Amino acid sequence: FLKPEQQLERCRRIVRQRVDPHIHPSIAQLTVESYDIPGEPMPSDEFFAKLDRGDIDFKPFMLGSEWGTTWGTVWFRLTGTVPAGYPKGKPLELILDLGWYPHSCGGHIEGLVYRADGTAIKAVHPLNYWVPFMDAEGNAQVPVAEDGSFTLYLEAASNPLLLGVPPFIETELGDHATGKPDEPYVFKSADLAEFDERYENYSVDLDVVSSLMEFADKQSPRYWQLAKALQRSLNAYDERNPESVEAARAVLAGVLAKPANASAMNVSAIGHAHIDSAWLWPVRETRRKVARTVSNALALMDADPDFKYAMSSAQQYAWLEEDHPDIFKRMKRRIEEGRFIPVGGMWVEADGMLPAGESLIRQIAYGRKYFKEHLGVEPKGVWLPDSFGYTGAWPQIARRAGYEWFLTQKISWNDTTKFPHHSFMWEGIDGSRIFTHFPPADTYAAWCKVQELDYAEKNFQDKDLSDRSLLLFGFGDGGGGPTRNMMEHLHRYENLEGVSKVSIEEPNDFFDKAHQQLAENAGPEMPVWKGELYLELHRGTLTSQQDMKRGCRQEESLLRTVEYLGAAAVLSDPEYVYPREELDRIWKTLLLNQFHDILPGSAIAWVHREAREDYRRDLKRLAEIAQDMCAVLRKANPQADLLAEARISQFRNDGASWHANRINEPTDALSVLTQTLDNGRVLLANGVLSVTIEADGTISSLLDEEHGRELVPAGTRLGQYELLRDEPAVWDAWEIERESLLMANAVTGSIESVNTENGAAQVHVHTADGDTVITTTITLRPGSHTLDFHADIDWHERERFLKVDLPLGIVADQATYDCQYGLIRRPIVKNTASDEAKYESSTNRFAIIGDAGYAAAVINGSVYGSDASPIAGNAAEGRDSGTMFRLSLLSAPTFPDPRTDIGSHEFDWSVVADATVDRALDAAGVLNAPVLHDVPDITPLASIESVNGTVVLDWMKLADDGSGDLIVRAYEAAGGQADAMLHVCPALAGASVHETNVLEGDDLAADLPVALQDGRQNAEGATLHFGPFQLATLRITR
Template structure:
């Protein structure tokens, strides 16, 4: 019986492969072909249509990597095909083993409008549904020679190194009869065979399908497949008509095409990928009014409006008809670990507003299937943006622990909960195959409590999205025994049904940490620094431009700030900010950050000059000034005239005592708040908090210790850092020079491998911290550079700053969940402490950290905090991090969480001194040291209203008074989009008293006299 089954299955597979599929386009005639190769970068469609084409044919080589070739295809429908369905079949030499990551194309009419995309699994183009015969064919095909960028050291990731070799050969260009009965038969057979293979050998249903297929193929005339297709389908119909059981799992299938906004291709190519995919799905919508397709990333919609208005107008029409569905509510599918709080909020502001303004749609689903872990700040921001649901898929990639739910309530830092779904199909590029359907049923974690899941289906990243074959599968799986019930529907319908079915879903509290891709916190450090710098420059630009507008009438740069924010948000996409893209993307990103920094500096400078006055007195105004470090969190946006000399100054002296640790002497730095000892190796052997006399550095374990590790993960070079790297470490203790830097700092120079590190160690006057200004000329490969600070603390957990607060993580490895967090993300600070004493490590551009704990021989505990400074993976960018990097970090002894918050801000928003003599009063002041004002700006609607966003930063309830330094007629609490919140705080002008729960974010809108009332 077993041999009989195997032989029947092999026969079925052979007939499907050799007879049925080839017969779908059985009758064919060649099309005429001409070709033109665009020089360099892609050209406008209008220019290409006027290009000097030359004759070409099948076998023609085309496409050096990243090149564009245009094909002009001509012909006519044969008269004998009258009444038949006719399609062009165009195979540009696609890679047959993958749906994307190959050549791609977009077909145009002679007037330049887009028709449909061409992809490896989608090579057809409908010419006539019922041909009359003689119809002319005149098509232009824009073909992109996108390479598959793979392999360590590949030159294909940069246009300048990719080389001139052609990658593709034109394989097939024909007009063909589309034999619909045969195509339908192929779909019947594929669905039944896939279902059959997923059923157990002991299941009668499997045998019924097998025997039905065997009998149906006995009806097939191998010499007349087309003529016998209807009879074969009739024989199969009973097997396809058996309904699913009443308890069958229910699947909401949503068409989707996950298109990374940049990854193994540059941004410019993503614009074209979106146009191709959108054109494909629009074609499917015309043929199937029940087809629903969801597309996230407002940026990608905006690209269509700007670059492909013909596609955009078709999209808008289908949005109105309910088929083309905006989802996500964000500007891009961003990383959520590393963007700052304001940036993550603005992802929702700009994404939701685009969909509202351009399409009249209030998106409610936050759609982030592929980001590399999810911040605990997200639930609050989701709700404050007016959204209700959250979807992710990536957690299925975790290496060590299986996430316990597929539908659950996700509770964020502040206690906000959002209803969340994690599709058990374990892919966001589903094809609705039998294997996927069977897997999702087996995998669904909430059996017995819930019975519904969502499946995003369609080829992404240049694969063209859903196909007509996928829609045929969905139709056959709507009610079929042995399969879950599949219904193609709007994602909002899924969430509403899932919520109604499972309102008492379990709760997951805190971040959704992804147990892989931890290297993305560090890769391409220079670009990460560009992101951090851009965020803080935007904060300053809004603050001082708003202050100057209110105080002096200085013009507020609405359009410039809007454009710059959108550029920064684009570059926070989950393969750009994590730096898991090709060299081309990183090069353009660096150029963009430099350009934006120059623009923002000009905006800041103009506003501050307007505020500072004419400066005739020769004085200075200090912007971003902060009070004494023990006086609490500084009022954000303070400005004051130049202060007198500080009461404390840094003293540098030789340290004979350090000879006990090294052959020669070191130095002591003392500013009255901190006393730091640098030994002859340039290491910190003592950091004392003067106020308490407490030593910070663990005995026998110096701080500021640079360490090297080998860095060759099992896979995904730029993405991953494997735990095994810790087993091999090289401490960098040898120095080239150690010498005073002026009269208040020490300069240390080290060389190792082919690299060089220069550090200036100093204690800023009046600041309770040790600054380490570090320059690394980095030329290593597959190496991880960290800097360690062993602290004399027994810290049971670390507090890592995240958006609008911090996240606690255990320092032990009691459970596999804790052990998996061996590399963690933090923003401006990471804090560790024990009752009565804490230490913060603050930085200006670093995200990767790790924290470990050891017991010393004296019985004390050493808690070691390390910053991850640089990596050198070779894929997908073989030159990752090569070159000069300057980064600053600082050790803050005796710090509580408010100190850590303040010092993190101070390191990232330094003082600015502008000639002038005006006293510039801040627009707003908060009187609570645990409350931070994260944004001061004018309202986005150009009404002139002032918008202030603040948050509780230290995890405690806070009663705060907000003093308003301008005449306001009313204050209204709003959502992130600056819309009034029902039941929110509303008051007339004057101070505003608020009570904030831990980590609560509040946005206030102040109306000015004469402004538009909101």
């Protein structure tokens, strides 16, 4: 006799047509005048200065017309007058429609509102386009006269929508703002209206009841009680009589006052608005987005108590402080009272896999320094909601910096497997554990719906040990933030049957409570995950926009040398001044370039063009600074001999780590013999290697003497190029897919020349496709166990992917790749579906593949992506066995950048025959060290001598203050236990050594091991004890 579906349809119609219009009924219409800026935006300071002195025309504008260019700005002057004595007990808001596309947000036009003074009120957004004007008492935001006239200003940004409802469509609107109406938007509405809260309360009540009905288990009493209440309330509501809206509200009161179930989860909600530093828009638009988001958050705090908001990146704080001092002051006032929570303590939200360990440490250091010196807040957790995987060295770095918990939600995007836990201990490759939580709502920007709460509650993977989870609600990836409607729904969700129990809470408190509950319930059975956090998605991010990875690695490798040279020069000349501020600026630029959408290479052409210019400029400047420091050192060291060309490579084998050594040094080995065989083949042979190069420019036989090993399986070619068809269905730049593999096409070349420059055999190969030319140089040096490859490529392809094959002839089950501060192991044999998901992993400067008694290594210059597969032999054909290892070189995506990586590229790699961990470390360090000129071969400042084990002295620098102390960062590399001795230069005689944390703060956790027993000692002769991947940090005081 009662049909619930009919009630739901009737409720939807009534809410859309008869209730929502009565919220914000217009009472006046505003006059609009326009002023266009087709080029780059004018700062608000300059605009208001010009406006108050004149210089602005404000041509008349009529509602319903189109205003914007492709990336230009439009300033609107809005004039109005209130009716006679109108504000009779209503807040009297202000509605501004800019022609919003309904089914989207934060991907297109927006704007801020200003008072003639020059201070912002609140931004306007697709679902947030109300601006507070007055109150019931009559207190206004802007000067209103006896006539009642008032004026406001509105800065409107016209940004194109690069993600339509058909996603991933190629466009040319992503660079060099043009000044043409590529897609104009209509204004069509600007009104002054009153705000009736009764109708919004009724709308929210109806929405909550109807949405609860969609998950309420038909054939349960709750479902039918809700249906009856909805029907009675809809019957009681008459649109002719305004007051009846209250009587209807008295019918839904019964079902909305029912308490939550005793077994429901406890949800902690914190306001959030993720902002990407540069993704589908330039950074200059990101600054405006940050300002608008903070304006919205401050307005929401003014309009509602019990609301809190968390903001993360320090660079965005710095931009806001520099650009909008008044917004910064208001935000600081809110921070001081504990309603605006800064989180993270990093410069930006960097990628988890690609940046080096020093990059992560510097991000933490600079972010923490900014937070301490500008906001007076010390975060206790790492806040990285969106990142394409995490390295596995993160837990130790976070634990040794002072953090206590970790936050992430990206792992929910996995292709194949479901991660076993949401609340757990993440343990690194060393043993340090941190408390990690994955928000089960599967998003960092929730809309506060019953659907999201139900999905989160039944998605939680720890229902047997915990009942606590964290909710991040707001609009994200382009700014926006929480709205008034979200909070008005969350107020209902506090104690409601069929829903979890929601409460606004600071994330620190949530993490404390959740960890306490987990530790109390679990005991010994507490969830632990050891290793890295591999993301089964976006595997093409290791190869896209190769210039980004190239510049990142090169700038780090040059910064290490520059900092070491500065430290050495300061200790040698009291009259030398260390360029601290310029190096800080360069470091901050690099850290900004290391963001989760810039370093992977998944942004528009504008962003990557700017990043390339930054890389070029900073690399040139760093080279010049290094030359200056070398000149100072030579002037202060007349006794040493100059080196025409030399490199300083950390961990050089044979007890000569931080010494500067020539590119070409005299050797006992004779010149490398060359020979041409019967059919164009070339036979290179030094004392230790025998290389055979076929007429196609491919290595067919790499024979190792004094071991008898053939490093190339029969029937395979080493150094052969493969072209794959990469046309993914989704996320073109982000993705390489399974089907792209198995559509490989080998590319064939030929030999052109053989040379012997300095006793080294050199072979030149040309490979062609048609507008795509690769020139390869194969080099063998006297006495070297390594074979070198250099490549110059002219990439002119489209939707193709380039790899090079390196068959090795070693049967191994797993492969050892280089991690940030150690080693990681990944399967070569893929038995299960989870294994096959890791078919394209990351390698950091080298990889090792070895059986019980023999290993070979592959060294790379600036390559990051690679894959490994088994080669199964057949004694009836001659193919023996082995491992197919392939390096990813280039890709040609189309969506965000329509012409990606079209041009000239350089690549370097090498194969080391009889390789151990140490030998691979030597090869990787030497190939990545920069080359300087006229370098004195002074003795190293500090040295680590390993009695047993492999310990790498990774970094030397000066302390981040005026003390002049020497900071040393070292770690255990092999993976076992190591014992080491510390030695110092003659200048550091009588100097003291003591252990600190990664931020030099001298305060360190008791749980973590120290590796410097007996504490403060003398620097010369100090004894060190490293566990597996220990990462010790020492401070040496003169």
